[PDB]
Ligand binder design. Structure first.
Ligand SMILES: O[C@@H]1[C@@H](O)[C@H](O)OC[C@H]1O
Ligand SMILES: [Ca+2]
Length: 329
């Protein structure tokens, strides 16, 4: 636990907050300010039960904790494990999208509605029909549509689904079979329903071939995020056991997306999760690691670092402890 100490010393970001553990940061600019919707790690395994909302009033501002806005006890369909959330706005309402586990052990995604971005949010009684697995991200397209992206394998259970239907004997593909991708569905105007069944998002390599299941350096693992820049859509995501946030580009929110490279090098703690958000004069990467907790994977803190799109559209790799650091993974 001294190799950990080198990384803390050269970390490029300090924890945005330290009075509670935070993870899975989803950043949005709502109503002139930056709101962050992270998960809330509890210091008792990932047994989170509630969400807070954080805010930066302006660039460089101190980070405000706007308090708890949703608890699993008010989510009647869910039993436990309030994981990586996201938010969207429409018609003056704010919607909090969140993955949670039913009593029978299956993850699904539910939504909660509020009249302000800081809530409080009133959760719908049933989960969103046609969703499953975890890690929602809702893209507010320039054209006025909203798209829901979701999925995570391993613990996230996506591997048990094909064409939106569960099977106990559905497993993660192996070898030369195409790796599973995240799901995408346009949202209905009423925002709490999908407008359509979800579709597979396909990630391609440099030769236009879907990433293979045995390509763990690049294949989708969990936590999709999409942002728009310079006329293209950027899909970014965690690769899980290779500990990277990678990204790919498409001219459509539906893909297919062509793999581009690594956006974030490995962080301390097993998981890595992020969002990418434009705030006034600067794009930022929001991410998390386990430095604050001394390396405990399930006790995380969110961070932010400035991100840069080059003229050719690529995004240079961000190294959370410096390019020189010995990677934690
Ligand atoms: O949603 C997150 C998930 O992607 C990860 O596997 O573990 C922590 C969760 O909050
Ligand atoms: Ca997310």
């Amino acid at each position: 636990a001294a190799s950990l100490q080198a990384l803390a010393r050269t970390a490029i970001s300090a924890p945005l907050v330290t009075h509670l553990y935070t993870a899975d940061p989803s950043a949005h600019v709502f109503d002139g300010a930056l709101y962050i919707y992270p998960s809330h790690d509890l210091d008792a395994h990932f047994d989170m039960a509630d969400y807070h909302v954080l805010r930066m009033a302006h660039p460089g501002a101190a980070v405000e904790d706007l308090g708890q806005v949703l608890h699993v006890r008010d989510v009647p369909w869910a039993q436990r494990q309030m994981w990586a959330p996201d938010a969207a706005q429409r018609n003056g309402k704010t919607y909090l999208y969140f993955p949670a586990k039913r009593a029978d052990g299956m993850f699904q995604i539910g939504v909660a509605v509020g009249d302000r971005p800081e809530g409080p949010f009133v959760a719908e009684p049933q989960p969103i029909a046609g969703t499953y697995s975890i890690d929602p991200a809702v893209l507010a397209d320039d054209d006025g549509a909203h798209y829901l992206y979701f999925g995570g394998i391993w613990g996230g259970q996506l591997q048990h689904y094909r064409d939106n239907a569960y099977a106990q004997t559905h497993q993660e593909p192996v070898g030369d079979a195409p790796a599973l991708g995240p799901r995408v569905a346009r949202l209905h105007e009423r925002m709490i329903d999908l407008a359509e069944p979800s579709r597979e998002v396909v990630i391609l390599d440099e030769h236009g071939t879907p990433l293979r299941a045995d390509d763990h350096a690049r294949r989708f693992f969990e936590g999709p995020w999409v942002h728009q820049h310079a006329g293209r859509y950027y899909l970014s995501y965690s690769t899980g056991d290779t500990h990277r946030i990678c990204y790919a580009t498409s001219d459509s929110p539906y893909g297919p997306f062509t793999y581009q490279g690594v956006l974030l090098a490995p962080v301390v703690g097993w998981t890595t999760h992020h969002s990418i958000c434009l705030f006034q004069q600067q794009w930022y990467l929001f991410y998390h690691d386990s430095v604050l907790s001394g390396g405990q994977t399930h006790l995380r803190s969110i961070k932010m670092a400035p991100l840069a799109h080059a003229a050719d559209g690529t995004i240079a790799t961000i190294y959370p402890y410096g390019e020189d650091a010995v990677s934690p993974w």
